[PDB]
Design a protein around this ligand. Structure first.
Ligand SMILES: [Ca+2]
Ligand SMILES: [Ca+2]
Ligand SMILES: [Ca+2]
Ligand SMILES: [Ca+2]
Ligand SMILES: [Ca+2]
Ligand SMILES: [Ca+2]
Ligand SMILES: [Ca+2]
Ligand SMILES: [Ca+2]
Ligand SMILES: [Ca+2]
Ligand SMILES: [Ca+2]
Ligand SMILES: [Ca+2]
Ligand SMILES: [Ca+2]
Ligand SMILES: [Ca+2]
Ligand SMILES: [Ca+2]
Ligand SMILES: [Ca+2]
Ligand SMILES: [Ca+2]
Ligand SMILES: [Ca+2]
Ligand SMILES: [Ca+2]
Lengths: 306, 306, 306, 306, 306, 306
């Protein structure tokens, strides 16, 4: 019965490798170093608690979907840990003012604005082989124009395929995380080589009465080779501020029974934290020590770990 | 006369096997274990009352045709019986929220997101040989990219042909049902190895006045080796709910004279069930015991059995 | 002069057989049992008044050319006479709803959906040898995939050639008519073994103002061994109805001076039948006895008989 | 000098036969009965004024090159003289509607659609021996499939070689002209046994502003044993009409100074015939007596006769 | 650590060239001759202190964004240095009155109003090859209509791509600066060949109470291959006057602690310059020697130089 | 030393005949009458200045290699001298229009289109014995089908061997030149009996910008018994014009220092002839007297004569 199945799946993983197959509800994950996305719900949706070092990740969605914010939050989180980041740009749209607001150390951010799509990929491969960079962000796949097209002479897909295998191997060896931002364009190479694929969309507005101050966002983990796929995350992205992390903390804290909200006050460990979600959120922001403890517990309860 | 024909067809079946030839109107079917599709009219169209264990089935149609819903309903029906299901995914589009609404036990659903089209087929074959899985769903044939294509080096058809014979044999031996979702692409291997091929399409909208709440669906059984082919099924797929099974039950109940609808009330066995099809449908939903009896009778009258 | 030629041709037929040579304008035909095509003009184009029992016939044309309709009309006409029909299918596209509208007795139609192109031909041969089937329809030559191709291992032509001689002999002996639907593919075997080859095409639309309700069709008898070849037929195929037989009857009736149309009314034997071709057509439909007599006369005047 | 050469060539012809050698510019031709090709320029290119009775002729070219039209015009010209024609068909593509437009008496045209390439040749030989047919047209060499090939068991070349010698001898004895249409395929037998070989091609379009109504055609007499070889002919083939004979008459009439075109009018024998080539052409068409006289003179001036 | 990174980046630059990658905060720049934009903040944003000779620059933005003013200020600055400028016009909108107010020497400005988009590019290439012109301004990309479009027969993108490579090479060789004004249209050729791309927009109005006398402008350096990209510049464009350079000088002087403004007076090197920013601005305008010294210091402190 | 060798070689020639052995660089040649090939460089490569009367020559190469042009130029050159030419054709591909453009007098060209390969050779032998023909061209060896093959009953080689000895003897006696065009096929008879064998190939295209107007040709004298073998010739064959003789004259004139080209003008004997090779070529074409003198000198300097 159970043994027969467990033994069968074992054979599958033995022949095809770890992560080749799993029950969507299992609390299993690869032992990979991760970098936070800046979103607690997304970190949980990823199972491993963040994006995996040494792998290829694809983040796609419509313009203004939030992929820009997400990408910058990842860079900021990485730099926070002392990790070196490189931005390979073919979009020419980085906003350093917004980036700094999200905590990005722009002064120390490495940047290249390649002459062709092929050159952009070659630079990524060189950086991957160097083992001197921790995170590489490519903005974006759709903008990586093949040299032949630029000169006005399927091509994009061919360009991606010819570089992906070597890139993936070099990234794994140096434990470098590479994120491809997309809108997906580029062919099947990225789709199959990616260890994680994120579908991000704006599903509504955040208002302060009549004034729109943010966006309701939803990210679906459509592909995940480090933990079970298909979980999703919903959170708010506030203009000029980024992901409303504390709002997520309150919601998850309440859902997991860590934060109580019956009666006139929300409370944690029996202590008052605020009247209403807003005040409770602001309180956690003003009390990092407690916020940190709640986050730790939420991760312990919801991450896909043994 | 009649004897001469019966004797001739017998020779055909003796030489070519059972199901090699039959009159489209005969009440004959193979003695195979089946899994419901979630649609009463389709189960009837299949003759045997559901999809056949141990065989290969192809379900194809345009995007949003309803093949997704149909596939999930099959998984849910199978799990309902305690059967183990595996989802081999190359589309990266499963929606667990909608799946749970259809009754799918996502937590216990096995899932693989293969690195190549060839790997996906090898995993299917391994699972088939293990005899530890009851239902395998492959989404989708069009997405099974050959390794050579992924690397940017007829190929898809060759990939399918090289695996089909062995896969079919292994599935039959372990009595594992495998469903290939398609849009058909892949060549002739699947077309000829499949025991059942379903053509599903959206033929209209279901409205509640001005608001669209569902789709009118039609499924044609274009190939059927377990019972007579070419029957069709029409039913509604309601957004967020799935196949309107009870609506089918009312329609078939009325057509088969089991449900009376003259006068002010619809009735069964002389008892009032509702005024109007809608109320009658809701009533059957609220009275499973009666609904179950009506379904049993409908199957007794319309399934292709001795 | 005339005698010298008649004597010469006689020698040709004596050495090579009846139908080996003839003047295209001669009123000669083989004494074969025939089945109507559902089209009066085509039955006339065939010279013998229909398709020949015991022979091989090829009907080819583009998709939506009308070959499907034509094939179903033949089956319906045959069943009308109490003849047994078998449908050997490798296309998986039969539409029983449309078939019933054309008069096909689907319930009594025998059907096989072979596993390979070779198996399909072997089943045809077995049925031919049994002498228990009157008409066999194969849909289609292009879809009869050789086993080697299905397994992904000139082949199609070889497959057809290896079976044709034996099939033709068995069909002749049991007086079974076999129709191969094609698009021609398959090699030269069918081309030379066929007693009749029909080229069917859609040459325009039939409209009711701005709405298209049918197709103008043209069938050319490119090969005919039962009567003189190369005659053609033009008729309409109306959606959901089939061949507009009565429209043909009116046209041929008028051309042969059987139906008068001068003045305000069309007439037959001096009796009013309608004002305008449309009304005259509807009238014949409402008066089968008169329609039957007109058809009989048209055949007497236009069929290639002594 | 001159005598030495004339005496030498005489010896060649004495040893090898008449037509074994000649100066390409000599006005010499065999005294053979001929049939017009329907083209004045081609009749002239042939030297003898038409195709030779009792000999084998090959007409080859791409599909739509005009060989079909040319072949039908020959049949029509022959029938015009009361000659009996036979069409041996393995292509199954004769269009009687177009044929009648070209003047072909379809009703009196003999036709055979042989079962094999060998049978087709045997029928040609039988007809040749009968002496009851004047013209035989074989469509086409490429379509004459050897029996062994049809049954799926160099062969075509062998088939042609085994029949050519006897066929040529029988045709000569009965003074029967045989034309092989080709695309050349079949080996060397036809190439060497043919008394005339024609290479026909479409070299452009004939337009009426923006609408294409015909084709500019060119025929090269690549082999000619009845008169000097290598002359060519250019003429137009108008859709639904055939060879623009009168257009050729005007061109040749003008080139030979028979038709004057200086000033405002074209003229013949001093009489106005039209303003512009088009009107002049139409005029000749409306005045057969004058057209006939001009053609007679053109032939007197350009045919290769003593 | 640091060495490992420095060595890695060195390899990148060695393989891909100088400027292929850099930290956004580094004080590095290419040793290129530059021309001032007329804006101190923009000159600083450019890192090198102005636009680069021998390269292609793109300046884009909405109508009335200020790109016109910026372009004219560049020409005026260039002419001030004795450099020869050419204006390639397809917009037909130059205002010489406003141009002269900005310091442009219209009388000596070369001008072409090309007949087609292709001709405009060919003239640019010819001028680039001549080495007789220092600055070329093209107004504008959107207005360069391909000849085929003009004649009413992707095309624009193809036109740009076919000329860009050769143009870039010729410009570099003669050290000619070329500026393409755009709104971006034209395809990817310009985007990748440009060494600098400027995004300019009007972000507000400048008022003198109730009267609007200018525009608040913002320029973002979205692409920069001569120094680190993404810096921005904000300044005012006053109607009939151009860029408020002295206003920028005061702001930057104050920000860099060069200009003191505590108490009742603004001061430099301890000397009073004015009460209020306006008076301080006017003072610098009236005292070029001091203004020049302050600008020199600001550049020393803010330009990206070793 | 030198004497010992000269005496030894003398013995060789005495025993085996003149031309049995020679130093490849010697200026020696047989005193045979020659006919120009139409190519100055080839005439020089032949050593004797043209093809030898009374001998057998083989010219072989791929289709479109230029052998056709070369062969026609030889005929034209011969006829120019009042010599009688005969064309023995088994290819049926002569183009009189192109031939006339090359200067061939088609009207006076003798032509035979033999019934078999054996007959073709017998006719060549008869013409050779007659002593009434100066040049015989056989097109081609590959097309000379043995009678046994034509009838479908090593053979070709045997056919050639049985005729070669007698043919060679008869040709020598009447001083008739015979050229066999080939593709080599036919066996060893021709290879050893030929006094000259030419290998001709197309080695590139001649363009007028983007339009191809000719072919770069190379002819290698692989066998030469009238002068030293192995020299080669390169020249252009222009479509519709033939060998670019004047282009060769300019090249050889320049190489031999006869034509000067330093400075702004090419010159001969100090007189300007043109600016650039093209104009210089056209000039020589317009000034035959000077061209003739230059050719005479080139031959005096480069032909292999005492
Ligand atoms: Ca590292
Ligand atoms: Ca919320
Ligand atoms: Ca509380
Ligand atoms: Ca099992
Ligand atoms: Ca309904
Ligand atoms: Ca009731
Ligand atoms: Ca029977
Ligand atoms: Ca009609
Ligand atoms: Ca009437
Ligand atoms: Ca006769
Ligand atoms: Ca013309
Ligand atoms: Ca005149
Ligand atoms: Ca210069
Ligand atoms: Ca300001
Ligand atoms: Ca102060
Ligand atoms: Ca002589
Ligand atoms: Ca050259
Ligand atoms: Ca000179």
């Amino acid at each position: 019965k159970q043994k027969a199945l467990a033994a069968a799946l074992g054979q599958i993983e033995k022949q095809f490798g770890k992560g080749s197959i799993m029950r969507l509800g299992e609390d299993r994950s690869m032992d990979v170093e991760t970098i936070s996305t800046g979103s607690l719900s997304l970190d949980i949706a990823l199972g491993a608690g963040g994006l995996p070092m040494g792998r290829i990740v694809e983040i796609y969605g419509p313009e203004s979907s939030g992929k820009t914010t997400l990408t910058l939050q990842v860079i900021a989180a990485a730099q926070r840990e002392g990790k070196t980041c490189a931005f390979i740009d073919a979009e020419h749209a980085l906003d350093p003012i917004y980036a700094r607001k999200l905590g990005v150390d722009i002064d120390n951010l490495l940047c290249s604005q390649p002459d062709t799509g092929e050159q952009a990929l070659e630079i990524c491969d060189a950086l991957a082989r160097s083992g001197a960079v921790d995170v590489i962000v490519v903005d974006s796949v759709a903008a990586l124009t093949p040299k032949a097209e630029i000169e006005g002479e399927g091509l994009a897909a061919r360009m991606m395929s010819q570089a992906m295998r070597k890139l993936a191997g070099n990234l794994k060896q140096s434990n470098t995380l590479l994120i491809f931002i997309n809108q997906t364009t580029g062919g099947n190479a990225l789709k199959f080589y990616a260890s994680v694929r994120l579908d991000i969309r704006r599903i509504g507005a955040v208002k302060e009465g009549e004034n729109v101050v943010g966006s309701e966002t939803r990210v679906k983990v459509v592909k995940n080779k480090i933990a079970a796929p298909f979980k999703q995350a919903e959170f708010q992205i506030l203009y000029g501020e980024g992901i409303n992390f504390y709002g997520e903390l309150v919601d998850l804290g309440v859902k997991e029974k860590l934060i109580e909200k019956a009666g006139a006050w929300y409370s944690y460990k029996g202590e008052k934290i605020g009247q209403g979600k807003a005040n409770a959120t602001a309180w956690l922001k003003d009390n990092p020590e407690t916020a940190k403890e709640i986050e730790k517990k939420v991760r312990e309860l919801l991450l896909s770990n043994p």
